[PDB]
Amino acid sequence: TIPYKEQRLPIEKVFRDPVHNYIHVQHQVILDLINSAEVQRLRRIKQLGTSSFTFHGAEHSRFSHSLGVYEITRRICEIFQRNYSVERLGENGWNDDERLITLCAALLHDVGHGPYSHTFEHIFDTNHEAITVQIITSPETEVYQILNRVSADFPEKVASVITKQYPNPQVVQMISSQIDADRMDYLLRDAYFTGTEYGTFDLTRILRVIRPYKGGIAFAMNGMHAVEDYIVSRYQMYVQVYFHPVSRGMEVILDHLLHRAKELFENPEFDYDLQASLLVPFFKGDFTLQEYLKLDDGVLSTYFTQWMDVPDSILGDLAKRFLMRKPLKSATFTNEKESAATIAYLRELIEKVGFNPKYYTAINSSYDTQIELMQKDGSLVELATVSPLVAALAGQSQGDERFYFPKEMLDDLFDETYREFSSYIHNGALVLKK
Amino acid sequence: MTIPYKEQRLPIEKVFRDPVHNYIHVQHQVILDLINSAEVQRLRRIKQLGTSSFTFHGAEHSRFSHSLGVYEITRRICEIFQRNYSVERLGENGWNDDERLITLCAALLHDVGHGPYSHTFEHIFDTNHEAITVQIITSPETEVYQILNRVSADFPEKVASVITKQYPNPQVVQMISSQIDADRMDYLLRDAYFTGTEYGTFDLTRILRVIRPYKGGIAFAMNGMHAVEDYIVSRYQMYVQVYFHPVSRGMEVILDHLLHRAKELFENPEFDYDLQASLLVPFFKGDFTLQEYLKLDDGVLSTYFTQWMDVPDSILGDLAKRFLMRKPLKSATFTNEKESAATIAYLRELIEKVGFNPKYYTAINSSYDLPYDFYRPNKDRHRTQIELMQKDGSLVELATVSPLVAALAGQSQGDERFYFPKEMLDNKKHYDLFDETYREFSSYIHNGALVLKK
Amino acid sequence: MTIPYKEQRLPIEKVFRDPVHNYIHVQHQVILDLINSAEVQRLRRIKQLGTSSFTFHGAEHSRFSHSLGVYEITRRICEIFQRNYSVERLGENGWNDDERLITLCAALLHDVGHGPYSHTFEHIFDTNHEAITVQIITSPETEVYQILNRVSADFPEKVASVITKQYPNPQVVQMISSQIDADRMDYLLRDAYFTGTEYGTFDLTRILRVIRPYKGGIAFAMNGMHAVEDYIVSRYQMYVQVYFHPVSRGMEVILDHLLHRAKELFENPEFDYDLQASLLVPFFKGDFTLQEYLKLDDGVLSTYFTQWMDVPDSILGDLAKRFLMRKPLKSATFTNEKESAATIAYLRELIEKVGFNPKYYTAINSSYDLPRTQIELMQKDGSLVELATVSPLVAALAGQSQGDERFYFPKEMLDQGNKKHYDLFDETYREFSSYIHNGALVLKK
Amino acid sequence: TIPYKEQRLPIEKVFRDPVHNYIHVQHQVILDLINSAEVQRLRRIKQLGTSSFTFHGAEHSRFSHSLGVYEITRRICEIFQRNYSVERLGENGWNDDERLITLCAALLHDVGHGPYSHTFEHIFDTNHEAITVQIITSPETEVYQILNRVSADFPEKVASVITKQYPNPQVVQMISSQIDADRMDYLLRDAYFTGTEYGTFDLTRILRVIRPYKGGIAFAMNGMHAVEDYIVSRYQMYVQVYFHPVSRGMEVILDHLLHRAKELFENPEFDYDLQASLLVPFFKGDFTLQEYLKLDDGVLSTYFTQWMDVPDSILGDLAKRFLMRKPLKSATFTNEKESAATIAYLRELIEKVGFNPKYYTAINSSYDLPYDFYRPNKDRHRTQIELMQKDGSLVELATVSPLVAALAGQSQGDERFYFPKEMLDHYDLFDETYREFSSYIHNGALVLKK
Ligand SMILES: Nc1nc2c(ncn2[C@H]2C[C@H](O)[C@@H](COP(=O)(O)OP(=O)(O)OP(=O)(O)O)O2)c(=O)[nH]1
Ligand SMILES: Nc1nc2c(ncn2[C@H]2C[C@H](O)[C@@H](COP(=O)(O)OP(=O)(O)OP(=O)(O)O)O2)c(=O)[nH]1
Ligand SMILES: Nc1nc2c(ncn2[C@H]2C[C@H](O)[C@@H](COP(=O)(O)OP(=O)(O)OP(=O)(O)O)O2)c(=O)[nH]1
Ligand SMILES: Nc1nc2c(ncn2[C@H]2C[C@H](O)[C@@H](COP(=O)(O)OP(=O)(O)OP(=O)(O)O)O2)c(=O)[nH]1
Ligand SMILES: Nc1ncnc2c1ncn2[C@H]1C[C@H](O)[C@@H](COP(=O)(O)OP(=O)(O)OP(=O)(O)O)O1
Ligand SMILES: Nc1ncnc2c1ncn2[C@H]1C[C@H](O)[C@@H](COP(=O)(O)OP(=O)(O)OP(=O)(O)O)O1
Ligand SMILES: [Ca+2]
Numbered sequence A: 001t002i003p004y005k006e007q008r009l010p011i012e013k014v015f016r017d018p019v020h021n022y023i024h025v026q027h028q029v030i031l032d033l034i035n036s037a038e039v040q041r042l043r044r045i046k047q048l049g050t051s052s053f054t055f056h057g058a059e060h061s062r063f064s065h066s067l068g069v070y071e072i073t074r075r076i077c078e079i080f081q082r083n084y085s086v087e088r089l090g091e092n093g094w095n096d097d098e099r100l101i102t103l104c105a106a107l108l109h110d111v112g113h114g115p116y117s118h119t120f121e122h123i124f125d126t127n128h129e130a131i132t133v134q135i136i137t138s139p140e141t142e143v144y145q146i147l148n149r150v151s152a153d154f155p156e157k158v159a160s161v162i163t164k165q166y167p168n169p170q171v172v173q174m175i176s177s178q179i180d181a182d183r184m185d186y187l188l189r190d191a192y193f194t195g196t197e198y199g200t201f202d203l204t205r206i207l208r209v210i211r212p213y214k215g216g217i218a219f220a221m222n223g224m225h226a227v228e229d230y231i232v233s234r235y236q237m238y239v240q241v242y243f244h245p246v247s248r249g250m251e252v253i254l255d256h257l258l259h260r261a262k263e264l265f266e267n268p269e270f271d272y273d274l275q276a277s278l279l280v281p282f283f284k285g286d287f288t289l290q291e292y293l294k295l296d297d298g299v300l301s302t303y304f305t306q307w308m309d310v311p312d313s314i315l316g317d318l319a320k321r322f323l324m325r326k327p328l329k330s331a332t333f334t335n336e337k338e339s340a341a342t343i344a345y346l347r348e349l350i351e352k353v354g355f356n357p358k359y360y361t362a363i364n365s366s367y368d369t370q371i372e373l374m375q376k377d378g379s380l381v382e383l384a385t386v387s388p389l390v391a392a393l394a395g396q397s398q399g400d401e402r403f404y405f406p407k408e409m410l411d412d413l414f415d416e417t418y419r420e421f422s423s424y425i426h427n428g429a430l431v432l433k434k
Numbered sequence B: 001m002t003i004p005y006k007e008q009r010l011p012i013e014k015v016f017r018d019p020v021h022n023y024i025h026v027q028h029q030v031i032l033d034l035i036n037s038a039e040v041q042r043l044r045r046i047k048q049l050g051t052s053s054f055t056f057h058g059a060e061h062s063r064f065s066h067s068l069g070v071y072e073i074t075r076r077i078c079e080i081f082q083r084n085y086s087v088e089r090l091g092e093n094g095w096n097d098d099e100r101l102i103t104l105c106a107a108l109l110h111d112v113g114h115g116p117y118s119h120t121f122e123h124i125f126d127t128n129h130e131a132i133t134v135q136i137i138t139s140p141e142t143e144v145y146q147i148l149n150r151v152s153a154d155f156p157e158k159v160a161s162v163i164t165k166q167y168p169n170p171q172v173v174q175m176i177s178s179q180i181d182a183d184r185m186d187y188l189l190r191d192a193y194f195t196g197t198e199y200g201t202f203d204l205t206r207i208l209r210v211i212r213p214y215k216g217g218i219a220f221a222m223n224g225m226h227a228v229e230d231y232i233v234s235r236y237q238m239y240v241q242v243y244f245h246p247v248s249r250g251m252e253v254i255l256d257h258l259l260h261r262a263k264e265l266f267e268n269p270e271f272d273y274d275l276q277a278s279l280l281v282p283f284f285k286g287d288f289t290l291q292e293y294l295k296l297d298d299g300v301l302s303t304y305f306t307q308w309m310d311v312p313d314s315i316l317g318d319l320a321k322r323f324l325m326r327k328p329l330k331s332a333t334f335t336n337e338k339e340s341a342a343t344i345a346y347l348r349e350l351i352e353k354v355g356f357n358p359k360y361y362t363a364i365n366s367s368y369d370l371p372y373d374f375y376r377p378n379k380d381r382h383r384t385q386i387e388l389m390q391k392d393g394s395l396v397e398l399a400t401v402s403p404l405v406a407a408l409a410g411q412s413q414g415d416e417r418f419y420f421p422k423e424m425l426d427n428k429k430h431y432d433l434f435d436e437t438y439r440e441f442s443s444y445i446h447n448g449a450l451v452l453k454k
Numbered sequence C: 001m002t003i004p005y006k007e008q009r010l011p012i013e014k015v016f017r018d019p020v021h022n023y024i025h026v027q028h029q030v031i032l033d034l035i036n037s038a039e040v041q042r043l044r045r046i047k048q049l050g051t052s053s054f055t056f057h058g059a060e061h062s063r064f065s066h067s068l069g070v071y072e073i074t075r076r077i078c079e080i081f082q083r084n085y086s087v088e089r090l091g092e093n094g095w096n097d098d099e100r101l102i103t104l105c106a107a108l109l110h111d112v113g114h115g116p117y118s119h120t121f122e123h124i125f126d127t128n129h130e131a132i133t134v135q136i137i138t139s140p141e142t143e144v145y146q147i148l149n150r151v152s153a154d155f156p157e158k159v160a161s162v163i164t165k166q167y168p169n170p171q172v173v174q175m176i177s178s179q180i181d182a183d184r185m186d187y188l189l190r191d192a193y194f195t196g197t198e199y200g201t202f203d204l205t206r207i208l209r210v211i212r213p214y215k216g217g218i219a220f221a222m223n224g225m226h227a228v229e230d231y232i233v234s235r236y237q238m239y240v241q242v243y244f245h246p247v248s249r250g251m252e253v254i255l256d257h258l259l260h261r262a263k264e265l266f267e268n269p270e271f272d273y274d275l276q277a278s279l280l281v282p283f284f285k286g287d288f289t290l291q292e293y294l295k296l297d298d299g300v301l302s303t304y305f306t307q308w309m310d311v312p313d314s315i316l317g318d319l320a321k322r323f324l325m326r327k328p329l330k331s332a333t334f335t336n337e338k339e340s341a342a343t344i345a346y347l348r349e350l351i352e353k354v355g356f357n358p359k360y361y362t363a364i365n366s367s368y369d370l371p372r373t374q375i376e377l378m379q380k381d382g383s384l385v386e387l388a389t390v391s392p393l394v395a396a397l398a399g400q401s402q403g404d405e406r407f408y409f410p411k412e413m414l415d416q417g418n419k420k421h422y423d424l425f426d427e428t429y430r431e432f433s434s435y436i437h438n439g440a441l442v443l444k445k
Numbered sequence D: 001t002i003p004y005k006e007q008r009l010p011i012e013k014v015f016r017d018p019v020h021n022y023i024h025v026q027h028q029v030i031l032d033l034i035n036s037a038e039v040q041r042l043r044r045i046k047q048l049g050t051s052s053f054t055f056h057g058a059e060h061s062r063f064s065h066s067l068g069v070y071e072i073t074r075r076i077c078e079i080f081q082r083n084y085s086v087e088r089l090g091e092n093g094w095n096d097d098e099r100l101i102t103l104c105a106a107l108l109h110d111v112g113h114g115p116y117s118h119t120f121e122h123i124f125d126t127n128h129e130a131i132t133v134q135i136i137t138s139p140e141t142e143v144y145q146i147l148n149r150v151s152a153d154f155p156e157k158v159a160s161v162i163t164k165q166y167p168n169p170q171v172v173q174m175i176s177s178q179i180d181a182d183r184m185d186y187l188l189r190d191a192y193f194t195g196t197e198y199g200t201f202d203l204t205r206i207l208r209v210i211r212p213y214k215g216g217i218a219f220a221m222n223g224m225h226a227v228e229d230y231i232v233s234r235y236q237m238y239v240q241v242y243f244h245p246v247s248r249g250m251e252v253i254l255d256h257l258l259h260r261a262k263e264l265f266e267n268p269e270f271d272y273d274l275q276a277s278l279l280v281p282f283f284k285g286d287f288t289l290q291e292y293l294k295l296d297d298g299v300l301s302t303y304f305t306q307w308m309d310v311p312d313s314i315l316g317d318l319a320k321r322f323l324m325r326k327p328l329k330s331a332t333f334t335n336e337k338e339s340a341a342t343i344a345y346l347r348e349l350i351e352k353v354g355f356n357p358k359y360y361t362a363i364n365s366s367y368d369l370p371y372d373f374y375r376p377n378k379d380r381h382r383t384q385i386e387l388m389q390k391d392g393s394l395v396e397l398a399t400v401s402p403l404v405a406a407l408a409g410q411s412q413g414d415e416r417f418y419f420p421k422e423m424l425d426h427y428d429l430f431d432e433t434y435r436e437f438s439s440y441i442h443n444g445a446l447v448l449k450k
C-alpha cells in the first residue's frame, strides 16, 4: 500500500472556479485538507469584508481564495518541473519533492483568518497568522490530524513555510513575496467579483516568465512588461477598491459597534443580556482556538440583529447602521497636526446636535523584498533598475487620509449648525478655519 | 416649485459596478430610496442559489445583486421600447412610458419576500415568498411601503398587482413575469457568471435588439429567432447542469431534515433543551409576524446550526455537523416509485439496521419539486408562450418554427433520486453480520441507479 | 547518449498565443519542425472559411491556425487520457501513450492537402484534398515527409494510415476523425470566435472532462451526456446560421462560375487572349503535379481575378468584378426540385431575354457542397449506450440535414424598382419579380 | 423624394463584428460607401501585416477595422445628440448636422492604405494619407461619386476632416486625437485577434464619460480611471505586440525583398523578367491611382512565389525566407554613434560566412513605426487628453494621474541590429567565425568589444 504522502487520486478531481476555470486536485492529502472542518468554515467568511457595500458582487469567500492560491501554486510547480527542474539546472532548479509541502502551505495560508479580520483584530487583539500556525500545529484540529498523517514533523514543516523559516527560499517565496500566488489570486479574484477588473493583468503571461533560482523566485527579463502589468493592476486595485471611502465608512461603523458591545460587556453596571454567546470569550479577552473556530460573518450579523433591540441607544443605532447600510461620510485632509484645531471644532458641532463623537467620528487612512529579473546570463537585476517610474507606483503612500462623520451633518432645530458644519467641507475636502 | 416624488430625478446618474452588466444605472429618486430601504438591504445577506455553493464554490452571490440585475435589464428594455416602439408611433401596439416607474419598482421588488434557503424554508415552515413580497409592498410598517405610498396612495397596491400579474397592462406584466422576462434573463447570466459555467451561453444584446411590445404584451422580431433559441438552450443547460445537481440537492436534503428535526424537537412538549434559536421560535410555533420574518437570513440559520452541534439530540447534532462540515447525502436514481417501493423499503431497513433513523437519513425527491420550470408552450395558454413577430406584424410561437426549441421542450424531464448516507458505501479485516449490511446495501446500487429487489 | 528524433523534447515548452485556446503548447522537436515546414506554413495563406468572410467580415482566420488548434485539442485529450485512463490502470480499455506522437502529427497534418477555396476548386478542377493530404505526408519531395521519415522510415505511411482510418488503433483513428473529434471541436470554436456568432460555443473543458478511451475507440462518460448535447446543439446552430448562409453561397456560385468560365476560355481555341494565370494552367488542362498544387493559395486566385477584370470576355470580366467588388447573386427558396422545375426553366428564359447568360448567371444550390448518430456513452460499469438511446430528439437534430434549396440569379432582375416608363423589355423584370414572394419562388406556369 | 443626405434604409442593416457585436448602418450613404470598390478593396489588406507571423490569429483586414472605427464614431454621435446637444449646451454642445460628415470620415480614414504600407512607403515612397485624400476627391473613384451626390463641396469637406483642417474640433478630434475612435478600435480589435489580453480596456466606460466642449472632446472627471486604462492598454499593445522583434525580423526581410526587386528592375544588365506587372509602375517610380488601387497582400505573395525561381540568389532566397517564415534574429544597442564599429565588424563576419550584409543585416528603431506614444504638451492642445471637472474647467490627464505620468515617463523607443539565425549554431568550417560573432551578443544585446 502507498504512503499517504504519495497517494494520488486515480482520477484527477476538478472544482469549477469562475477565475481559474478549474481547480485541479491530484493528491489525497490536498483533498482531505479541502474537506477538513477548519478549511470548510472559510466558506462562511467574506474575502473582502465590508467592500461588498460598495461593490455588491464582492460576496466571494476566503475558501474560494484559498483554493485559487493552491491552484496558482500548483501551476507554478508544474511549469518549474517541466522547464526548470534540478535535473536540468541543478542548484538553480526546482526540486519537485517540495511540491506537497508547498501546496499544503498555499492552501492553508489563510486558515487563521476570522470574520472581518482588520476590525476584529483591532478590537479583540487577535492575530490571524499566529492562529494559522496554531491550526496547523494543534492536535485538536482536523488539519493537524491530516498533516500529522504525512509524517510526524510535517505539521511543523508546513508552519515553517508560513513563518518563512523553511530552509528552501523557492518554497518560502512561492507562498510569500512581492509577486506570489497569494497576491495574484486575490487581485484576479477581487477584480472578477467586484467587476473592477482594471486588475486584469494576464496570469498566463506571468506563468511563462516566472522561474526558480538558488536564492528563490525570479522572472525572465523578456517578461519584464508582464511584471509591470501586475504592478499596475495592483496599484489600480488599491486605489479604486481597497482604499474606497464608502467601504471604510462601513468599516468604521463596524469597528465602533464591536467596541461599544465590548465596553457594555466589560462594564459591571450594565445588567443586560447581549445574547452574544460566541463573542463572550473575546469581550473578556480570553479565548480558546475552538471558540475562535466557531466564529464567521453570519455570527456577527445575527448578533447585530439582536442588538437593534438593545436598551443602549448607541449600540442599537450602530447595529442598525451596519445592517441597513448607513455609512459615515468623510472629508479628506493632508495634515493631521494642522487640521487638529478644525477637527476638534467640528466634533463639538457634531456633539451639540447629539451624536457622541467618539462613536460617530473617526480619523482613518486605510482599511488598515525585491522583484528580481533574471537575464539570459543567469544574473539578476531588480525591477526598479530597468523600470523605475513603474517601481515608484508600487512604493507610493496612497494614504487616503480622512475624517468621518454622520451624513446628517450635511445638506430638529439646529439647521444653522448644519450650514456651519458643511461650510468646512468643499468638494469632499475639509476646509481649515476658526 | 417642488417636483413630485414620482418625477424626481438624481442630480447626476448613480452607477453601481456590476460584474455581469458592467453598470447598474439609477436615475429616479424613488428607485434609489427603494434600493436603500431596510427590506431590500436585507437581500444582501441571503444567497441567490442557496446550497449550490457546495458544488460551485463561486456561487456566493446574493438576492440583492440579482434584484439590481433585474431592475437593470428592465431599465434597458424600457429605454429601447421608448426610443424605438413608443405609442407616439405605434398606438395600441406601442409602449407607454408612463409605465416606466411602476415597471422598475416591480422589477426591483420582485424577490423582496424571499427568505434564507426559501425553497427548503417554505417546505418546513409553510411560508410563501410571493404572499410575503406583496405583504412587504402593502404594509405600512415597512420602508418599501412608505416610499411607494409617497408616490401616491394607490401605488403600493399597483406595484403589488404587477407581481400578482393582475395589473391590466400585459407589456408591464410580461416584462417582469413571462417565459423570457428580465428575471430569468438575469439569474441565468449571473448564476452562470458566479458558478464559472459556460451555460449562460446567451447574448443579452442580441435579444435586446429584437424585443418589442405589442397589443398583448411582449414579442420578439422573427429575424432574432436564433437569439431566442440560445436563451432556451442556456435555460435548459443551467437547469440540467446546475440547478439539478445531485450533490447540491444532497446538501439540501440535510438542511431540510435539520430544520424539520429542530421544529419537531421544539414542538415536542417533553424535549426540554434550549435550542437557542429565538428568531426561529415564531416559525417552530407556526405563528409569525412580518417583522420576525424580515429578521431572517442565511447567517441566522448558520449561527443556530453551530450551536445545535452541541445540543443533546443525536440526530439534530449530527445533521448540523453534516451541513456545516459539508457531508452531503449520496443518492441513486430510480424511475417508478411504485416499482421501486419494496426496494426502497428494504434499503431503509438496512439503513435503520446500522443506527441511522431512515426518516432523517433517507429521502426521495425529484427535480420537479424545485422552483425551475421547463418551457412547455400551450396554444390555450397565452402566458406559457414565447411569441415571435413576423415582419408583417403576425405572431407565431417559438417551438412551431424552431426544431431545436421543440427538441429541448420535448426532452424536458424530472429525475427521481433516493438519498442515503455515504457510509452505506465503503476494506476491513473482519466482517461482522453488521459489516455484512453495507455490502448487502451496495449490491442494490449499480451505475448510480437502484437495482430492484426482484 | 544521443537522443532519437522521436523522443527529442524541447528543454523549454514552446507556446504560441492563440485567441481561441489561449496557448498552443509544443513539447516535441518533431512537432515544431512540422509547424515550421513549408507545406504547413503555406496554410497561413488559405482562409479556413473561403467566402464566409463576405458575410461575416471577422472570419479571416487561416487554415494554419485551425491546424494548430486541432493539434492543441488533441494533446489536451492525450494528457487527460494519460493522467486518468492509461493502459497501466485500465488495460485493454486504456490509452497507450506511445501512440501520442503519431496522434499529434496526424492532428496537425490532417488538413495540409487543402488548397484555396476548397469546395469550389474541387468542383471545377476535380482535385481531392484528402488524397493530396496523403500525398503530402508520403511524398519525399515535401518537407513534411522528410521530417516524418526521420522519426522512422515507416512513419510517413503510419501517419497517412491514421487519416485514411486504416491505422489499427481505433482510439487514435477516432480522436482524429469521428462525430465529436478535435477537428470539429476546433473549427466550431474557431469559426464562432472569428464570426462573432458565438452560439457555436459549447464548453470545451467540459467535454474534455467526460471524454474517455475504451477498447473500441472513444466514448463519453454517462454523467457527461448533457455536455455532448451542448456540442450537438452548437454544431447545429453553426450549420444553420453560418455554414449554410445564402449570401456566402451567393459568392461561392460567382467564384465557381468564374473559374469554370476561365477554364472554358483556355480550352477554347477561338479565344486566343492570354489569361496571365500561369499557376492555373496545369489545372485548366486537368494534368497537374503536387508541386504545382502547393504553389496555390487565396492570393494567387485574387491576383488572377484582378487581371481578368480587363480581359475581352464580358462574362469573365464581369464575374471577376462581381467577386472582387462583392456583388453576390441573389436567391429565392423553393422546396422540391420536381414541382419547381418548369418555373425555374421559365425564369432562366426571362434572365436570358434581358442579356444574362443563365449558364453563368443562375444556379441551383442547396449547400456549401456543390453538386445518423454514432456517439458512445459509457456507464460506470463500462457498458455502452448510444447517445440517441438516452437523448433521441437531440440525436434527431444531429442527423437532420438542413436542406436549403435555392435558385440563384442576378440582383439586377429585381434591382429595378420604379421606372418612369415601362417598355416590353422592362416588362421582363417586373414579370420575373412576380415569381418571387418574400424570398421564395412562386410556382406559376 | 428624400435628399440623399437624409436617406435612411427602410430597415437598419447589421454587420456581425466579434469586437463590437454589431456594426449598425442606418444612412444610405454609408451603406453605399461600404459597398464601394475602394472600401471592398480593404478586405484584401491585413491590418497588422507581419504580426501574424508572431500572433497567428492576427489575420484581420483593414476593412473590418474601418467598419469598427465607424461604429464607435456612431456610438459617440448618438451619445452626443442624446445628452449634449447644442440645443441644451450651446457652444459646448454637439451639432448633429455634423453626424454624416463625421461618419463618412471615420469609415474612409484608412482607405489610402496599401499592402504592408509601412514597408511599401519606405521602398516606393508612397504616402497613404495623400492617397486617402486622392481617393476621396478624384472623380474616377466610386467613393468620390458617392460623396459628390451628398452636396457640392462634400468630398473636399470630408477630406478636410482627415487632414484636420475642418473647422469643427469636435469632428476633427473624434477621428484623430490622442483618444479617437481609430485608436480605440485597433487597440480592441488587435488585442481580440492576437489573443492578448493587454489591449482590452472598457469601451463602454469611456463612452459613458465622453463629452464635447467648445474646443473638442473631453472626458468627465468621474471617469478618469477608464481613461487611465485606455492608456494602459495602449502602452501594453505597443511594447508587447507592435514592437515584437520577431514580427520586425519578418518586416526587415520583406523590406529587403522588395528593395532587391526594385534594384534588379532598374539595372538594364539584369535580363530576366520579374513577371510582376502590377509592381512595375512602382519599380519605375511613376504610377497612377488606379495602378495603386490594384494592389493588395495577395498580389505581393503571388509575386514572391514567382521570385523564388527567378535566377537571382538573393531575391530567390529572400522570397523563400518570407514565404517559409525565416525571420532575421536581432540584438539591441543604445546608439548608432557608440555602436558603429561593432556593427561594421559584425557585417564583415556575416559577409565572411557568405551573406551579403546589405540584404541580410539591418538597423531598426521602434520609433520608425506608425505608433506614437502619449506625450502631452501644455502648449499643444492636440497632444492632450482633457478631463472635465464639475465646474466645467479642464485638466490634462497626466496632471491628475501618476499612473499615466509613469507610463508616459518611460515611453521609450529601441534600436536593433538584424542578422541571420545561421550566425548562431556540427560540421562547418566556418565554426570559428560563428563562435566569434556570438561573443558580441550577450543578454540579447550588442557587446561593444570593438
Ligand atoms: N446608495 C447605495 N449605493 C450602493 C449600494 N450598493 C453599492 N453601492 C455603490 C453605488 C455608489 O456609487 C457607491 C457609494 O455608495 P453611496 O451612494 O452610499 O455613497 P455616496 O458618497 O455616493 O453618497 P451620495 O448618495 O452620493 O451622497 O456604492 C447601496 O445599497 N446603496
Ligand atoms: N469534495 C468537495 N467538492 C467540492 C467542494 N466544493 C465544490 N466541490 C465540487 C467539486 C466537484 O465538482 C463536486 C464533487 O462533490 P463531492 O466530492 O462531495 O462528491 P463526489 O461524488 O464527486 O465524490 P465522492 O464520490 O462523494 O467521494 O463538488 C468541497 O469543498 N469539497
Ligand atoms: N452590403 C454588405 N453587407 C455585408 C458586408 N460585409 C458583411 N456583410 C453582411 C451584412 C449583411 O446584412 C449581410 C448580407 O449581405 P447583403 O447586404 O449583400 O445581402 P442582403 O440580402 O442582406 O441585402 P439586400 O437584400 O441584397 O439589400 O452580409 C459588405 O461589405 N457589404
Ligand atoms: N517557430 C514558429 N513560431 C511561431 C509561429 N507562429 C507564431 N509563432 C510564435 C511562437 C513564438 O512565441 C514566437 C517566436 O517564434 P520563433 O520560433 O521564430 O522565435 P524564437 O524566439 O522562439 O527563436 P528560436 O525558436 O530560437 O528560433 O512566434 C510559427 O509558425 N513558427
Ligand atoms: N475589508 C477590506 N476592505 C478593503 N480591502 C481589503 C479588505 N480586506 C482585505 N482587503 C485587501 C487589502 C489586502 O492587502 C488584501 C487581502 O490581504 P489579507 O489576507 O487581508 O492580508 P492583510 O490584512 O495582512 O493585508 P495588508 O497587509 O495589505 O493589511 O485585500
Ligand atoms: N467555404 C465554406 N463556406 C461555408 N462553409 C464552409 C466552407 N468551408 C468549410 N465550411 C464548413 C463546412 C465544414 O463542415 C466545416 C469545416 O470543414 P472543412 O474540412 O475545413 O471543409 P470540408 O471541405 O471537409 O467540408 P465538410 O467538413 O462538410 O466535408 O466548415
Ligand atoms: Ca491569501
Ligand SMILES: [Ca+2]
Pocket (backbone or CB within 6 Å): B066, B070, B110, B111, B183, B187
Ligand atoms: Ca428573481
Ligand SMILES: [Ca+2]
Pocket (backbone or CB within 6 Å): C066, C070, C110, C111, C183, C184, C187
Ligand atoms: Ca480540420
Ligand SMILES: [Ca+2]
Pocket (backbone or CB within 6 Å): D065, D069, D109, D110, D182, D186
Ligand atoms: Ca485606422
